[PDB]
Amino acid sequence: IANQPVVIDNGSGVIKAGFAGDQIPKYCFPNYVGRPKHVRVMAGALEGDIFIGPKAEEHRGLLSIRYPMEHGIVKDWNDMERIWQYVYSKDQLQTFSEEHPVLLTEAPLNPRKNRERAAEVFFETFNVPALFISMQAVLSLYATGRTTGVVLDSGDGVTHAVPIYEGFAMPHSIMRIDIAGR
Amino acid sequence: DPKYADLPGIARNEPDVYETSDLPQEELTSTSVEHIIVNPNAAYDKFKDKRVGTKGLDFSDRIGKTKRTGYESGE
Numbered sequence: 001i002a003n004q005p006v007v008i009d010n011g012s013g014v015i016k017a018g019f020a021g022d023q024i025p026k027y028c029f030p031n032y033v034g035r036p037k038h039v040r041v042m043a044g045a046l047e048g049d050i051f052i053g054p055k056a057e058e059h060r061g062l063l064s065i066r067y068p069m070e071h072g073i074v075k076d077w078n079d080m081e082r083i084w085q086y087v088y089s090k091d092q093l094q095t096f097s098e099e100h101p102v103l104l105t106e107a108p109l110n111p112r113k114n115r116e117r118a119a120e121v122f123f124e125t126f127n128v129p130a131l132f133i134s135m136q137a138v139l140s141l142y143a144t145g146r147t148t149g150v151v152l153d154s155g156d157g158v159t160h161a162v163p164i165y166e167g168f169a170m171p172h173s174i175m176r177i178d179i180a181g182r
Numbered sequence: 183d184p185k186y187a188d189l190p191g192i193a194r195n196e197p198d199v200y201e202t203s204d205l206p207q208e209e210l211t212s213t214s215v216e217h218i219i220v221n222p223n224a225a226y227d228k229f230k231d232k233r234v235g236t237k238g239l240d241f242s243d244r245i246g247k248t249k250r251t252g253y254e255s256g257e
């Protein structure tokens with residue numbers, strides 16, 4: 001058996017992704033969700049309206065945008081699924097769900113029901129063999145190599161400070177304020 | 183002699199035709215607007231098989247939904 005997983009870094013607005021053991025997240029872009037702000041009749045355009053990717057930057061002044069991952073919490077489940085399906089595109093992935101595992105990020109202090117519904121998606125609709133989601137501070141630990149310390153991370157709308165010594169938690173010690181750049 | 187001595191009042195020697203003598207843009211300097219060399223078959227192959235579908239092709243000034251954009255179904 002050989003199934004290289006995919007390190008997928010979510011976030012407040014931005015999402016990053018690349019296979020295991022890489023050095024640069026192969027694909028990175030935010031939660032921008034768009035669909036044409038105007039009406040087309042004449043042939044020459046594209047059809048579907050869920051046009052998200054480089055085309056969005058290519059067609060900024062044409063579509064309406066939205067960000068359903070409010071404070072890192074999914075609202076438009078369907079749209080997030082579509083986002084992930086866009087991730088599943090060939091030039092975007094070329095792999096299947098069952099073909100590889102995936103690693104993901106956990107923004108703490110959120111309702112786990114979000115994770116419930118999402119887990120059902122990736123293990124029922126998609127059928128990924130295994131998917132683990134975890135604290136973003138641990139990621140910073142591996143990047144630094146150190147195991148002791150606090151890490152305050154900030155995306156576009158959430159800030160959380162994690163004090164953990166030697167990779168050993170102190171849940172009460174952890175603090176946060178969820179508001180940033182947005 | 184059709185009518186010479188008969189009728190002396192009918193025209194002849196008349197040159198009633200009134201003669202004469204034989205005596206006989208692309209300011210592309212500007213940079214205003216382009217044109218395209220027509221090739222109907224090239225553009226025909228351009229718009230070759232666009233399976234445009236007209237589901238609910240409605241463009242009235244009706245006010246009952248969000249927006250209306252027909253000619254939307256594809257392959």
Ligand SMILES: Nc1ncnc2c1ncn2[C@@H]1O[C@H](COP(=O)(O)OP(=O)(O)O)[C@@H](O)[C@H]1O
Pocket residue numbers: 010011012013014015153154155156157181182
């Ligand atoms: N050049 C920049 N200047 C200021 N802020 C930035 C810049 N680049 C990114 N940011 C902000 O920092 C955040 C990156 O933190 P991260 O947790 O990776 O974001 P996200 O949570 O959206 O993935 C982005 O969400 C963005 O709001």
